[PDB]
Amino acid sequence: MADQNERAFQKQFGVNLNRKVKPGITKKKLLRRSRDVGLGFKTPREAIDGTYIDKKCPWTGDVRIRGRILTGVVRKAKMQRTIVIRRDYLHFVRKYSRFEKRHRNMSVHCSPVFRDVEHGDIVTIGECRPLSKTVRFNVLKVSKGQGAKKSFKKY
Amino acid sequence: MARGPKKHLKRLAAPKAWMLDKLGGVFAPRPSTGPHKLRESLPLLIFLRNRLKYALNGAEVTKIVMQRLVKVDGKVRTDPTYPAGYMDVITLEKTGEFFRLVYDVKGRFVIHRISAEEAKYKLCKVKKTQLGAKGVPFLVTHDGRTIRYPDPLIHANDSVQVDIASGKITDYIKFDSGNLCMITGGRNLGRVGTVVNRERHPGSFDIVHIKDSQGHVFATRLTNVFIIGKGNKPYISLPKGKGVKLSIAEERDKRLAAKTH
Amino acid sequence: GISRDSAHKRRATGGKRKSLRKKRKFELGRPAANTKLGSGRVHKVRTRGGNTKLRALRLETGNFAWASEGVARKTRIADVVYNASNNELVRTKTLVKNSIVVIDATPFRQWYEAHYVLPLGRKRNPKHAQKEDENDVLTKKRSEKVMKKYLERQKYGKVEQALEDQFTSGRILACISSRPGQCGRSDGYILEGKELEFYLKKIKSKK
RNA sequence: AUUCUGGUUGAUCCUGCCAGUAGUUAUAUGCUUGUCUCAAAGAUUAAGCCAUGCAUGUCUAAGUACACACGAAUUAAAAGUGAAACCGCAAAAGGCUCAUUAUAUCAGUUAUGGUUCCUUAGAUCGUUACUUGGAUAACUGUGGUAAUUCUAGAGCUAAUACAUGCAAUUAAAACAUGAACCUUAUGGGACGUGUGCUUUUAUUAGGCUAAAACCAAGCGAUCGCAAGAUCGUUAUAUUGGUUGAACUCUAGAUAACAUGCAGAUCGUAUGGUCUUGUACCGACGACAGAUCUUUCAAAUGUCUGCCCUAUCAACUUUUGAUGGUAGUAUCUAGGACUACCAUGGUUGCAACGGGUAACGGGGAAUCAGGGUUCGAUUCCGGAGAGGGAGCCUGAGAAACGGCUACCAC
RNA sequence: GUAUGUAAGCGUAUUACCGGCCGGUACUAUUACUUUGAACAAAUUAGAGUGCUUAAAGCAGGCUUCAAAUGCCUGAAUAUUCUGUGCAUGGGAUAAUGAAAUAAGACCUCUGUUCUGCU
RNA sequence: GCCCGUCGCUACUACCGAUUGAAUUAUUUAGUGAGGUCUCCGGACGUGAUCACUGUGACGUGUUACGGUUGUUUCGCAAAAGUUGACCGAACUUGAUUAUUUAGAGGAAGUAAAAGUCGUAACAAGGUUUCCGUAGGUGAACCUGCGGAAGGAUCAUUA
RNA sequence: UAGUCGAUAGAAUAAUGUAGGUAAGGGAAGUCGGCAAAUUAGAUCCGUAACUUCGGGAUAAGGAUUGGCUCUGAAGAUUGAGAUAGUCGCGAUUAUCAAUUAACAAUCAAUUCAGAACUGGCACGGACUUGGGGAAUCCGACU
């Protein structure tokens, strides 16, 4: 992406790598501890390997993704570190004794751990600490990102 | 931050388990902010006046409770609006009746007369155990009592016998799925026994599946499940018929049957 | 007055948010402390529930920490060099969260001569000799111990090249990570590995 | 009770609406109205405007009495009771109304690792005046403006107001870095500052499968007179932790920080023991108090839903629109706000706009059911208090039966 | 003599342990829908218990007993409207979706091959 | 027999319309901008601690302490009126905009029409079948022209 | 720069003039008539109607801003580096390769358009240049 090059030096609160005085070394070069997303939700391994600062990320940030787990389809991948999902469902109105198909279009934060997020991906989103006005969610799993043909590379 | 508390509780907005009669009064007794949560708490005002008929009015309740005759869990309880909810021992020293507030199968409080030696203690479900405040671990009960330095095997949703005269833990029953239970509000309220299993749903609302001694099985959330005992022997005296929950019709058959007048 | 509430300013539909609530004191926000570089004043503010959160106006001093050495000392805040948020803040010398601060460096250095006896940068023949208390700390002796301790230390003692330049120049790069507007004190991380490398590029480009 | 019946014609059959017809806690109005129980009721329109009165004030044995208010008499009596006034707490809402207001409010559904919580309930404070200091009300006296009231001036006097800070205010202990001592260092230390809770920053211990062959400082054991050289069974590389975790979580260590707390209280009732200093030390709960929980709460956030309208089709980005980053604000996340940087966000699944006798829901009316209509109002939540804006106090009000301002009255 | 609806067998998703078929663990196409649970504010609505003297309904009161007496006592249920939704669970019909035919196709297994990586 | 419009009376309703009418509302640019708060100050006043001059005591005239509505030189903490810069911003003015209301010479409709005036248009082939689209002309009806349909007067016969 | 300084002059510098200006407060009341005079003017930005032959109306209307100094950014031209090897004494001679590459870097050019402070007494198109505007009507289409 960017080499986390913003006007400020991007640092995570409470991790300064201590060169000087404290017992030496077994490789990895990084004090980066990484998550178990645990509603049996498996981590993407780029969390552990992530140079990316993202303080609004649950993998690199001091945030809980708290509450409602919903599954939806990405309609717009356009934004740097957030995506739009449209969820479309039947709401049964008893009066009309038929439904109306109805939509809610909601912005949801894509941490840059999640790569090949493209419209039309089915994505598992969790309500998040409500992150920037229309962004009230964060992606807990990209369950699609996909390409059932594309997973194994076509000749 | 904002607004209240707003101290006025209207009758009809008032928790139904109290059995406040609609007429005569727009206004409910509103138990002041104590150790027991407002909906789950039986004000001294209702208990003395409506049930025990020692007091006719609200003005009579303040006269008795000011006399310091109503000594809820080791304490004088000067306040007639004192909440006094669950497992609390109300001792009317002259003349001596000794009560525990425990639950009817109809999810109402009962007048339950306990032995003066049963009145010494009480059973406390443990909300939370946290580490740091003096002298370093502390346990807090559902009746807001903090008991310092708890036995290290006491884990959240366990019960402790509390000595009351001193605030000490003098027994603990681990939340293990064949321990005797009374459930405290869900709709299943004061039904009893014996917790077949729990199904843990991580975040949130862990559901406990409970089998009463009529072998009827029913389910409540873990926050509603209070552990009171061992399968067969409850540590406190249960109110009659031992929260079995028949049907209203089966109760009607038994009731109608029980009189030759 | 100054109001949080999400309910001001156009929707994502661009829909005109009408009114509903005057401005409530539930929504309260209050004028920025804008804390300056200088003579130690701290004022109490009554904050919701009761609690005093301190607005500092004019703070000389901070707690600037060497993370790698695990030691932080109280030092004078000489200057504000850079601010990523506003250039005006640099000029006015206001102490902010991540405002880049040039310290003062003298009490740090005395103690690291007293941990390594390696003068960090390589000082000078009259400067070493002149003990207020430089040379006394260097030589020490007592046979024996504290000299023995300096022998144990130093596969580590080389001290990063960037830092050694900064150390003897007497002005050390840092970022303040406290809000002295609500936390009443101005206190920072001293820029070590990665932290220096990004900022140092910004120094030499911007000037 | 899934109901029709009258009316186009000369007569006749449908299409059709209209009338009749029944109900309406659904409002008006007429006439008539003996009795009983029950009660909605200035909503619609005028969320118009208001004379006069009242709805928010408050004292116990328990903060403060030198009220001559009453009680005083015999010993130093003030003490008792308690208006006033200080002090503390309430006044943030009950109540009223439903205007603005159409996803907004709000219900159900939920979250808070995004936060605050007086109070109450329960627990917590051993790191040289011990009970000191002086100023003011009430008071006394003298005044001001036509005035409510606002207070000027002079002279007192209290504190659970204020100002300090000792004789239980106490250091010891142990660990850090200083070190007398010893020896090569498996290594440990007298005496020391510092080390209370807290506030504030940084760093760290944190969530850890089993065995071997060597080397350097040797811990036992062995080989060698030594010098020297080998090997090794075992404890062990060990804050946890909600759990989406590198949480700053309830809490700590190391390095630094600032500054509150730890009662110069009061009322009950006085004992033990005299070297009788008026000594030492002592129970309850009232009001403080600091940490922590709990409780009354709360603000924001999730999911899903609302009438009519296209004779409203593109909309948001002047100046945040929508996103990144960093800051600031705040009780809190947060474009809430600001710099910089991207070009996004919303839309025929009707967006944006306009209208609404449009607060929402719980509910009500009317029914064969299905529905249609209603809700301004007896509850719950939110909102407002002539329209608007700004603010103090306080745990909490952007308050109006608070203030300050403007504009209208 | 049937009937088979119910139960257990047998043919690439009931396979595999541990503890004595049971009960976990390891488990597994997305949905819409639907099933069963919890979670559904009271009033209202339906309605239980009950002579508010009838009744609207109130939530009283009845009893041995108008004796002597707190003695015996049932109570102020249950459902649904607070829809849909969400949570949890079951089904695999209906309607869609799914690998892999330009096979870097699915397993498995051999290279200690590779890279990450340890108390 | 049905029967319509033009024309004329009267009554009622809505439209267009000079006035670039009028009124009120909510958004809006720009300008102006009360007040509060935050913030830079100010020092009305009031003391400490120190110094003196006087009185007193202590100590070796001097010093120190205390007092004297005391005076004066150092340097502090609080502190009013006023006030600096900022941000919120009521309010006002003027353009723009929108919703809603309503005056109006006059024009031009429709209706109630009900005793009228002029025609016979259509209803029978209504004496010119009807009726449509469209143009022009007729007092009007309507006629006419061009292309149609049958809802015709041909459901047709007619090598 | 080149060419003039000849327009008969001096003193007074009256009225009245001519030619050039200014004038409080009110602001067209003036007059045949806004004639004369004044406002306005450039630029950049924002905003922009009736009506319409859709081209215009339009510089509509209505608003904002302009100096100086001090910085910053953007906008071009040209070859060069870098790495390795052999020969002779870092210097000289010879051989190889594409990536490097949005200023690659380096250097040279010459000004444009934008943004930010500081700054003065609103002073900022400062001289000069240089539309007053809108609403209707009569008339000829127009130059």
C145-158: buried (b, 16+ CB within 10 Å) or exposed (e) per residue?
eeeeebeeeeeeee
Find tokens 């030691």 and name the residue: C71
Measured distance CA(A108)–CA(A68) in Å, rounded: 13
β-pairing, C71-76 vs C61-66, is antiparallel
Measured distance CA(B84)–CA(C149) in Å, rounded: 65
CB contact residues (below 8 A), chain C span 40-79, against chain A:
66-70
Asked whether the beta carbons of B86 and B40 are under 8 A apart, the reply is yes
> Which of these, C80, C107, C88, lies nearest to C167 by C-alpha position?
C107
Residues whose CB is less than 8 angstroms from the CB of residue A15 and which lie 6 or more positions away in sequence, other chains included: A31, A32
Measured distance CA(C148)–CA(A96) in Å, rounded: 90
The structure was resolved to a resolution in Å of: 6.0
**Residues of C contacting chain B (CB within 8 angstroms):** 24, 26, 48-49
Q: With a 7 Å cutoff on the CB, does A1 touch strand D?
A: no
Which nucleotide's C1' sits nearest to the alpha carbon of C31? Answer: F38
Burial tier of B84 (Cβ tally within 10 Å: 0-12, 13-18, 19+): buried
Which nucleotide's C1' sits nearest to the alpha carbon of A147? Answer: E99
Residues whose CB is less than 8 angstroms from the CB of residue A13 and which lie 6 or more positions away in sequence, other chains included: A62, C177
Measured distance CA(A65)–CA(A140) in Å, rounded: 8
Technique used by the depositors:
cryo-EM
Which nucleotide's C1' sits nearest to the alpha carbon of A87? Answer: D349
- Asked if A20's CB is within 8 angstroms of C68's CB, the reply is yes
Asked if the C-beta of B136 comes within 8 angstroms of chain C's C-beta atoms, the answer is no
Asked if the C-beta of C193 comes within 8 angstroms of chain A's C-beta atoms, the answer is yes
Q: With a 7 Å cutoff on the CB, does A80 touch strand D?
A: yes
Asked whether the beta carbons of B123 and B102 are under 8 A apart, the reply is no
Measured distance CA(B212)–CA(C8) in Å, rounded: 55
Asked whether the beta carbons of B173 and B124 are under 8 A apart, the reply is no
Residues whose CB is less than 8 angstroms from the CB of residue A104 and which lie 6 or more positions away in sequence, other chains included: A86, A87
Q: State CA A116 to chain mean position distance.
A: 12
The β-bridge partners of A9 are A5
Rounded to whole angstroms, what are the CA distances from B36 to B39, B118, C164?
Answer: 9, 21, 63
> Which of these, A138, A142, A116, A143, lies nearest to A127 by C-alpha position?
A138
Find tokens 């070493």 and name the residue: C128
Q: With a 7 Å cutoff on the CB, does C43 touch strand F?
A: yes
A11-41: buried (b, 16+ CB within 10 Å) or exposed (e) per residue?
beeeebeebbeeeeeeeeeeebebbebeeee
Q: With a 7 Å cutoff on the CB, does A44 touch strand D?
A: no
C75-105: buried (b, 16+ CB within 10 Å) or exposed (e) per residue?
bebbebbbbbeeeebbeebbbbbbbbbbbbb
For residue A75, report the phi and psi dihedrals to the nearest 5 degrees.
-105, -30
Rounded to whole angstroms, what are the CA distances from B24 to B44, B55, C158?
Answer: 19, 16, 87
At C147 the three-state DSSP class reads: helix
Residue C201 CB coordination number (10 Å): 11
Distance in angstroms: CA A20, C1' G132: 80
